[PDB]
Amino acid sequence: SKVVYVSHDGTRRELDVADGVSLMQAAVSNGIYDIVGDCGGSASCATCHVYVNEAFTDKVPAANEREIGMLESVTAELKPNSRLCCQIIMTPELDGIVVDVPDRQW
Ligand code: FES
């Protein structure tokens, strides 16, 4: 399924992500350098921060308590649509999802 990672300067990078793969994993294994994913996807670091386009924030599972706590420590601006993309699992239902990546993770 399609996922578009828009870098902070506007570059739209599209990837085909298989079902069950997190957006963080697909990102770090396909050159999306603006996403670090340091902890490996256990909602333990804040380095996979992205802004989910509002047309999809409702189709994606709500952030659990751990993510909510971790998001408080994001280094870039924290927005209402901020999410740790390691917590977003790709599914056909999300095909076309767009996420904007901040200018910093650390
Ligand atoms: S990869 Fe660490 S919180 Fe997402």
From Swiss-Prot:
Binding residues annotated for [2Fe-2S] cluster, in chain numbering: 39, 45, 48, 86
The protein's name: Putidaredoxin
Gene behind the chain: camB
PROSITE patterns noted in UniProt: 2FE2S_FER_2, ADX
SUPFAM superfamilies to which the protein is assigned, alphabetical: 2Fe-2S ferredoxin-like (SSF54292)
Top-level taxonomic group: Bacteria
Domain spans labelled 2Fe-2S ferredoxin-type: 1-105
InterPro entries, per the entry: 2Fe-2S_ferredoxin-like_sf, 2Fe-2S_ferredoxin-type, Adrenodoxin-like, Adrenodoxin_Fe-S_BS, Beta-grasp_dom_sf
A GO molecular-function descriptor: 2 iron, 2 sulfur cluster binding
Named cofactor requirement(s): [2Fe-2S] cluster
Family recorded in the similarity comment: Belongs to the adrenodoxin/putidaredoxin family.
